[PDB]
Amino acid sequence: MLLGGFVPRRFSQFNRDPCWMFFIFSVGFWLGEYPAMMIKYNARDLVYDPHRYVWSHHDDHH
Amino acid sequence: VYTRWKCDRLPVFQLKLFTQEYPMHAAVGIFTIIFLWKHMSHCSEETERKYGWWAGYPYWRDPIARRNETKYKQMIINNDVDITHPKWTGCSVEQLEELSRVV
Amino acid sequence: VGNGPTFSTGGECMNTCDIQNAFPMNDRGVRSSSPFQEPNTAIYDSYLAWTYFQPMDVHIEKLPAPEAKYYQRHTKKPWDVSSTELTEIQSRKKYFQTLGYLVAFIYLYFLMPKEKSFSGLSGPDGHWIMLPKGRPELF
Amino acid sequence: DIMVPSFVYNKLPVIHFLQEKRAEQKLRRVLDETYTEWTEELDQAHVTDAITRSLNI
Amino acid sequence: MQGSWSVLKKNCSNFFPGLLAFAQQTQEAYGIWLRIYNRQQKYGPTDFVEQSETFSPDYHKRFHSQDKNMWVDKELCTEVSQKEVARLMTYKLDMWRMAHCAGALLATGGYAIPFGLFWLANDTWVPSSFNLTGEELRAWREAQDLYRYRSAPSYLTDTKWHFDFHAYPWNETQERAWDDLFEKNDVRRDPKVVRPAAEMYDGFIKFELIRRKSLRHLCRSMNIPTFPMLARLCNGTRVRDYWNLAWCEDYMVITQRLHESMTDEELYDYAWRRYLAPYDKNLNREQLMERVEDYFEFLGPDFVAHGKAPNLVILTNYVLGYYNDPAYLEGDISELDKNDYDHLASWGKDAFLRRLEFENGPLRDQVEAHTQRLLAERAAIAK
Amino acid sequence: VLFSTYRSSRLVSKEFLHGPVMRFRALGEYYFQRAWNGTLNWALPGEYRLYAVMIPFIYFYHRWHNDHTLDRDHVEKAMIMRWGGTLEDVRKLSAKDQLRVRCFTDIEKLYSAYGPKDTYLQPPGDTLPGKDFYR
Amino acid sequence: YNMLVFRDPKRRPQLSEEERAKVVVNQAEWPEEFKDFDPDDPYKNSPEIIKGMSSWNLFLWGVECAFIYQFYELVFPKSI
Amino acid sequence: WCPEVRDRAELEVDITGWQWWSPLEERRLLPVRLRSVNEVREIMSKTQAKKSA
Ligand SMILES: CCCCCCCCCCCCCCCCCC(=O)OC[C@H](COP(=O)([O-])OCC(O)COP(=O)([O-])OC[C@@H](COC(=O)CCCCCCCCCCCCCCCCC)OC(=O)CCCCCCCCCCCCCCCCC)OC(=O)CCCCCCCCCCCCCCCCC
Ligand SMILES: CCCCCCCCCCCCCCCCCC(=O)OC[C@H](COP(=O)([O-])OCC(O)COP(=O)([O-])OC[C@@H](COC(=O)CCCCCCCCCCCCCCCCC)OC(=O)CCCCCCCCCCCCCCCCC)OC(=O)CCCCCCCCCCCCCCCCC
Ligand SMILES: CCCCCCCCCCCCCCCCCC(=O)OC[C@H](COP(=O)([O-])OCC(O)COP(=O)([O-])OC[C@@H](COC(=O)CCCCCCCCCCCCCCCCC)OC(=O)CCCCCCCCCCCCCCCCC)OC(=O)CCCCCCCCCCCCCCCCC
Numbered sequence A: 001m002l003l004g005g006f007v008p009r010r011f012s013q014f015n016r017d018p019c020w021m022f023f024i025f026s027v028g029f030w031l032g033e034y035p036a037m038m039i040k041y042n043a044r045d046l047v048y049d050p051h052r053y054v055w056s057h058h059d060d061h062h
Numbered sequence B: 001v002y003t004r005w006k007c008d009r010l011p012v013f014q015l016k017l018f019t020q021e022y023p024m025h026a027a028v029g030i031f032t033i034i035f036l037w038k039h040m041s042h043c044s045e046e047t048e049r050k051y052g053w054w055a056g057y058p059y060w061r062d063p064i065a066r067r068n069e070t071k072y073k074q075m076i077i078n079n080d081v082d083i084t085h086p087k088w089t090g091c092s093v094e095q096l097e098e099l100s101r102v103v
Numbered sequence C: 001v002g003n004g005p006t007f008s009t010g011g012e013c014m015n016t017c018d019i020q021n022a023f024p025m026n027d028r029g030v031r032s033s034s035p036f037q038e039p040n041t042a043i044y045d046s047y048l049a050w051t052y053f054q055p056m057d058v059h060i061e062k063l064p065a066p067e068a069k070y071y072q073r074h075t076k077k078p079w080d081v082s083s084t085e086l087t088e089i090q091s092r093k094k095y096f097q098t099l100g101y102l103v104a105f106i107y108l109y110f111l112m113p114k115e116k117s118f119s120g121l122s123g124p125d126g127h128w129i130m131l132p133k134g135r136p137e138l139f
Numbered sequence D: 001d002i003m004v005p006s007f008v009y010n011k012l013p014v015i016h017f018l019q020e021k022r023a024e025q026k027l028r029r030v031l032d033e034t035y036t037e038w039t040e041e042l043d044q045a046h047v048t049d050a051i052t053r054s055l056n057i
Numbered sequence E: 001m002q003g004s005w006s007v008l009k010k011n012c013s014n015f016f017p018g019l020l021a022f023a024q025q026t027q028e029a030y031g032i033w034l035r036i037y038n039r040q041q042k043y044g045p046t047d048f049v050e051q052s053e054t055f056s057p058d059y060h061k062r063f064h065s066q067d068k069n070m071w072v073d074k075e076l077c078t079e080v081s082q083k084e085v086a087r088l089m090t091y092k093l094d095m096w097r098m099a100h101c102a103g104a105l106l107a108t109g110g111y112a113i114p115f116g117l118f119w120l121a122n123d124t125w126v127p128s129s130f131n132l133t134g135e136e137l138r139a140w141r142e143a144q145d146l147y148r149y150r151s152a153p154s155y156l157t158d159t160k161w162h163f164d165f166h167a168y169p170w171n172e173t174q175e176r177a178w179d180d181l182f183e184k185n186d187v188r189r190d191p192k193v194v195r196p197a198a199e200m201y202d203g204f205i206k207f208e209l210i211r212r213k214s215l216r217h218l219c220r221s222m223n224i225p226t227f228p229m230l231a232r233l234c235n236g237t238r239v240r241d242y243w244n245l246a247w248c249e250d251y252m253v254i255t256q257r258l259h260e261s262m263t264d265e266e267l268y269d270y271a272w273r274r275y276l277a278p279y280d281k282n283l284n285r286e287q288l289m290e291r292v293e294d295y296f297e298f299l300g301p302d303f304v305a306h307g308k309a310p311n312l313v314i315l316t317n318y319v320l321g322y323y324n325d326p327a328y329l330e331g332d333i334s335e336l337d338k339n340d341y342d343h344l345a346s347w348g349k350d351a352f353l354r355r356l357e358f359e360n361g362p363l364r365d366q367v368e369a370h371t372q373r374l375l376a377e378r379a380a381i382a383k
Numbered sequence F: 001v002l003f004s005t006y007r008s009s010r011l012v013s014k015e016f017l018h019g020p021v022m023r024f025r026a027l028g029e030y031y032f033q034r035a036w037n038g039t040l041n042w043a044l045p046g047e048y049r050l051y052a053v054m055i056p057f058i059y060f061y062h063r064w065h066n067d068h069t070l071d072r073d074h075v076e077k078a079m080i081m082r083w084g085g086t087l088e089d090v091r092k093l094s095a096k097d098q099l100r101v102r103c104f105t106d107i108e109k110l111y112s113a114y115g116p117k118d119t120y121l122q123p124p125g126d127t128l129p130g131k132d133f134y135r
Numbered sequence G: 001y002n003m004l005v006f007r008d009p010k011r012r013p014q015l016s017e018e019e020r021a022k023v024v025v026n027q028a029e030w031p032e033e034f035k036d037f038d039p040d041d042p043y044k045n046s047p048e049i050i051k052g053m054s055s056w057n058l059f060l061w062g063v064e065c066a067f068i069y070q071f072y073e074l075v076f077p078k079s080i
Numbered sequence H: 001w002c003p004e005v006r007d008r009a010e011l012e013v014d015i016t017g018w019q020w021w022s023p024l025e026e027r028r029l030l031p032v033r034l035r036s037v038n039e040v041r042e043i044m045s046k047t048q049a050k051k052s053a
């Protein structure tokens, strides 16, 4: 119902309550997983599967 | 003082709730359950292949065939069924031997 | 003063509720959060207003203990279960239920394999049951 | 475990208030129906008069 | 009451003698009922004999009307005595329970035997004839009184809550009657004060409009079996018949002042059949007489004058109020010196709790003043 | 007579496991039994920290389940179909090759309907194997 | 104030202006946690749950966990 | 330790009386309060005059 509770004023206060500490940890995970995907999936050495035209989900569901 | 929800144990309260509080709802639910298990409790092999598998049917091993093979082996072994009987083959045993020698 | 809870409010403001008259009003004009008399009741304004009572150390003239005859009623019946006993029973039951649900959650979301895997490395592919046994005449 | 308990908890305050009012009403009745009864007793002057008459005065 | 092995042994030992006694009582009660029914059919009013139909104004469902479908035979003493009427009432209760059990047996064949074992282990639903000694009868009466205690408060609360939530009394006297009607048995209710509630509830709900759930509660409180309940016009008929017999007997006693000459045990039984005197209260003759006189006063002069009793719903509530014991309270007051949330002490207070304590504690006025002054200064600076 | 219908018929003592139960109730009551913890039909509490703690945990365990149990099936199907049509054929590859294939599958998942169609449509003249490679 | 959809509750004033003006403020009696109390930042002086553990440190911990989750298979791949 | 309230609430809920507001009973009982001494004098006076007549 969103009636009350501890509310940090800014980022630096997220460490003043264990629950918000876990929340900021989770937010860090969430936002930092995107740069990781950028680096991993736009890598120079990433190579498409040679057999990618052998089979695809598009033919299977069709 | 006595109250059903506070004094009676859970099974007793369940029976009371669905017999003297919501009996018609229980009756309708049982009716619908019977209907579902009478008309919506079957799935053909083709339907299983089309929609019954999360990623698709693995034809490269055909688990349905293995399942049916196990089923039929179990039935034959337990019930002592002679699969060479003419009714199963449509021909006499001697004709079966002749065919085996031919092929 | 301690950190214990008080009479539950449901997140409601008693100065505007439909049963506000049931909640005593103090000198400051703030209706209590409980049937009891509260001197330091306050109202907080989030998206919705809600009443709050802060426990404090206050001395109240304690009337001397009466005799057991004038307040004890020995009308207890075999079916009767007191609220304290009910709370004890429910606490124990919910503790055991919580442990069981925790085990179930762990098994389901971290150990239980999904049925009918494409590779066949995990989960069952299904099998038949209720097959006849020892009934040669059936065939 | 959840619903009936919550509604009982919601009921408690109103019932407490009403029962307090009922008790106040009954004590109010106790005091309302009390009256001081002043009794009247035969005046002794008539007794004295009858005594005089008996004397034949 | 819960089942027990001792009661099971008692009822198993007395099973066949109990059945034989029940059969004899059945013959006697059939004779009595034949007399009563012949008298009703011969001298009864046209509406009562013809079973006039009274339909509800909302859904037009037929039910017994207290005025038309109930008749007090003022001249029944000539043919039937008071003791015969009491015997018929007791046999009606026993026959109802036995009939339900026999119906279960016929329906389920030989699969009712374990349920019969559950039945004989408790005296709640066994006939009175199964008790061959005074102690057994006392235990049976205790079980019946326990069932009445279990069931009555629900009926009283249903009635009171529905009326109070959907209606209010018209005048002060009705208010007083309504409030005093549902007092606990530890206090004595004045029937003259309480009677107007009958007319008020007649304005709200007559016996012809009684709801099925309230009827179920009432039948539970009257030791009348409720399974299978079925339509409300079956147990309703049972209730009507029982209270019609009770009213006939009451008129007989009032006219002939039989209760004054009635002995102690018979008087106690007479009160008990009216649901006025529990056996566990160990009442003396004075208290029984007081309760019986209060019941007669509640019936009112019109009962003798014309055989018209007050509203049956309110009458049942009034009589069953004697089984509404005060709410139990056990434990010395010293127990109130303990604490309930000691297990939380180790957790302490978090930042929000500390803030709330600081703002709403003894320093609340200072904090409020400081905060308001700071906000006013900031607002002035902004402007 | 065999079993009681009343909850009052106790099966254990009042002090059985009192301490652990008190700890569990302390855990339950500290954040929930508060004036500002007003629920909406028992499902949506008023305490902010409850959301802040439970949303991440629910997402975490759901994602772990999905990644290690559900999407794994699609990944394995792709690996098997594109590299022999049999599990042994895939196992004939090295771990690094499997990693490459699975990451390509992740690429395809990320593209979905908003990306180049050459990942599954073979342009004319392409020298890579076709659908009838293993047939 | 607000942090996303979470709004900080505010206590309604209970004293009138006349009574309020007569109140004498003595911050010496206030706890050290709440001195120079500001409604717009009441937790500025609130102690840290763990000494030396900053919010940025936890954010970075989560980011590192995500990086591990995405990169562990690149360094220690496993066969089907 | 307030058994009457407990019993009434539990019975009301167990008989399908979920609602927690009773405006009519409150309206009947809201203005109830202990009388002042002068009111007691007046009411006793009315009772006494009634008894006399
Ligand atoms: C010893 C037990 C009693 C023996 C018999 C006693 C004497 C007879 C009794 C009365 C018989 C009624 C006959 C029919 C009347 C008319 C209705 C009708 O048309 O019926 C069709 C059909 C009967 O067929 P039929 O008409 O006799 O003729 C055969 C035809 O040739 C078939 O033609 P068809 O095309 O209709 O066939 C399709 C299919 C159609 O089959 C169905 O549709 C099956 C429907 C089942 C309905 C169940 C009703 C009760 C539901 C309770 C609430 C459950 C909520 C959901 C819970 C989910 C999670 C568990 O028919 C069947 O194969 C019938 C098989 C029935 C098996 C019943 C097994 C019940 C299991 C209950 C499990 C409960 C688990 C709770 C766990 C809780 C733990 C905390 O189905 C039923 O009648 C279903 C109801 C049967 C009730 C039996 C009596 C009560 C249950 C006793 C056993 C309890 C076991 C508990 C196990 C617990 C394990 C943990
Ligand atoms: C294992 C066994 C399985 C058993 C299965 C069978 C069913 C269950 C059996 C019985 C279960 C026990 C409980 C039953 C309910 C009890 C009700 C109750 O408490 O009544 C008290 C009540 C006593 O109170 P009362 O104050 O003396 O009188 C009531 C007041 O009048 C009340 O005053 P009021 O103000 O309320 O007045 C209104 C009252 C007035 O009514 C009455 O109360 C009078 C009595 C009922 C009269 C019913 C007959 C009406 C005329 C029918 C004309 C049909 C012509 C068709 C011609 C066709 C030509 C081709 O009610 C009505 O107006 C209702 C009328 C009926 C409407 C029926 C509508 C049906 C629609 C059908 C839809 C489509 C169906 C599917 C398609 C079919 C075609 C393809 O009892 C009765 O009045 C009679 C009760 C009769 C009970 C049922 C007996 C069952 C016998 C079963 C034999 C067959 C067994 C087969 C076994 C198979 C193998 C297992
Ligand atoms: C073999 C086949 C079996 C078929 C399957 C049966 C399945 C079981 C169902 C139940 C069967 C009945 C069980 C026995 C009951 C005992 C006899 C009796 O009626 O007691 C009086 C008593 C009457 O109650 P009431 O409320 O006072 O009656 C109001 C009337 O105004 C009362 O009128 P009143 O105020 O003017 O006063 C009259 C009173 C005045 O009398 C007295 O005061 C003297 C006492 C008389 C009654 C004594 C009863 C004694 C009961 C205990 C017996 C001993 C048990 C021993 C157990 C241990 C054994 C080791 O006398 C009466 O009580 C007479 C009542 C009317 C006669 C009812 C009997 C009709 C059926 C029999 C004839 C069948 C002929 C078949 C022809 C075939 C042609 C093809 O019966 C009851 O307590 C009612 C039964 C309670 C259970 C109900 C269960 C549901 C029933 C649904 C049936 C639906 C139709 C059937 C299909 C079902 C499919 C699902």
Ligand SMILES: CCCCCCCCCCCCCCCCCC(=O)OC[C@H](COP(=O)([O-])OCC(O)COP(=O)([O-])OC[C@@H](COC(=O)CCCCCCCCCCCCCCCCC)OC(=O)CCCCCCCCCCCCCCCCC)OC(=O)CCCCCCCCCCCCCCCCC
Binding pocket: B011, B012, B015, B016, B019, B027, E001, E002, E003, E100, E101, E102, E104, E105, E112, E113, E115, E116, E117, E118, E119, E120, E121, E122, E124, E125, E227, F001, F002, F003, F004, F005
């Ligand atoms: C020789 C004798 C003389 C001759 C015979 C005479 C005639 C005798 C018969 C007539 C007797 C009538 C009077 C009976 C009174 C006693 C009734 C009674 O039971 O009282 C409760 C009685 C205790 O009574 P009490 O202590 O005296 O307290 C009485 C109070 O006044 C409390 O009173 P209350 O009012 O509060 O209690 C009432 C409560 C009564 O209920 C209960 O209390 C529940 C009793 C069961 C509780 C079970 C709890 C334990 C569960 C255990 C589960 C398994 C655990 C694991 C086992 C592992 C084994 C290896 O609630 C109800 O009344 C609900 C009624 C529900 C009616 C249901 C109607 C369904 C109709 C279907 C819909 C139809 C719609 C129309 C469709 C039409 C379509 C055309 O309960 C017990 O003693 C519990 C017994 C538990 C036995 C063990 C568990 C079950 C074992 C099953 C074995 C199965 C073997 C075969 C398996 C095959 C598999 C393939």
Ligand SMILES: CCCCCCCCCCCCCCCCCC(=O)OC[C@H](COP(=O)([O-])OCC(O)COP(=O)([O-])OC[C@@H](COC(=O)CCCCCCCCCCCCCCCCC)OC(=O)CCCCCCCCCCCCCCCCC)OC(=O)CCCCCCCCCCCCCCCCC
Binding pocket: B010, B011, B014, B015, B016, B018, B019, B020, B023, B024, B026, B027, E100, E101, E103, E104, E107, E108, E111, E125, E216, E225, E226, E227, E228, E229, E230
């Ligand atoms: C956490 C999980 C825990 C486990 C959970 C388990 C799973 C449960 C899931 C589902 C639960 C809800 C299901 C609800 C279904 C729908 C109910 C509904 O629509 O009710 C409407 C409606 C509601 O009832 P009501 O009369 O308004 O009041 C109900 C209150 O509970 C009345 O309360 P009250 O306070 O007003 O009165 C209290 C007292 C008042 O005292 C009395 O009234 C005196 C004593 C009366 C004794 C009984 C008299 C019966 C007279 C004849 C009845 C008609 C018979 C019809 C023909 C026979 C049909 C079979 O009555 C009693 O104490 C009754 C005692 C009954 C004990 C039996 C209860 C069932 C326990 C299980 C035994 C059977 C197990 C079979 C399966 C296993 C097989 C291996 O039902 C009726 O109208 C009753 C009709 C009864 C017909 C007979 C039963 C038909 C069903 C088939 C029976 C099969 C027998 C098999 C024998 C063994 C074969 C091997």
Ligand SMILES: CCCCCCCCCCCCCCCCCC(=O)OC[C@H](COP(=O)([O-])OCC[N+](C)(C)C)OC(=O)CCCCCCCCCCCCCCCCC
Binding pocket: B031, B032, B034, B035, B036, B038
């Ligand atoms: C890809 C294809 C998609 C197709 C989708 C189609 C829609 C599917 C929707 C499913 C979900 C919604 C279901 C809603 C419920 C539907 C209910 C329904 O239609 O069920 C009917 C069905 C009809 O049953 P039936 O199909 O067995 O009918 C038998 C009729 N003969 C024998 C002629 C074939 O009901 C049941 O299945 C339950 C039957 C048992 C319970 C009732 C027993 C009592 C019957 C009383 C009358 C007869 C006996 C005499 C009286 C009593 C004597 C004791």
Ligand SMILES: CCCCCCCC/C=C/CCCCCCCC(=O)OC[C@H](COP(=O)(O)OCCN)OC(=O)CCCCCCC/C=C/CCCCCCCC
Binding pocket: F001, F002, F003, F004, F009, F010, F011
């Ligand atoms: C009814 C049985 C008749 C035949 C005699 C069988 C005796 C078997 C030997 C049993 C020895 C152990 C007994 C332990 C005490 C059991 C007490 C009991 O029944 O309590 C029930 C109690 C529940 O109590 P409440 O519902 O809360 O209410 C109770 C009060 N109304 O149930 C339990 O906790 C389960 C206890 C199970 C004990 C073992 C019962 C075994 C019964 C076997 C019967 C079959 C015949 C056995 C023959 C054996 C020959 C060597």
Ligand SMILES: CCCCCCCCCCCCO[C@@H]1O[C@H](CO)[C@@H](O[C@H]2O[C@H](CO)[C@@H](O)[C@H](O)[C@H]2O)[C@H](O)[C@H]1O
Binding pocket: E037, E038, E039, E041, E042
């Ligand atoms: C399986 C069925 C079981 C049924 C169980 C119940 C049976 C009950 C039988 C009761 C028999 C009563 O017997 C009957 O009583 C009535 C009323 O006095 C008599 O009725 C007689 O007097 C009345 C009243 O003046 C007249 O309205 C009526 O015309 C006349 O016949 C009948 O002449 C008599 O035959």
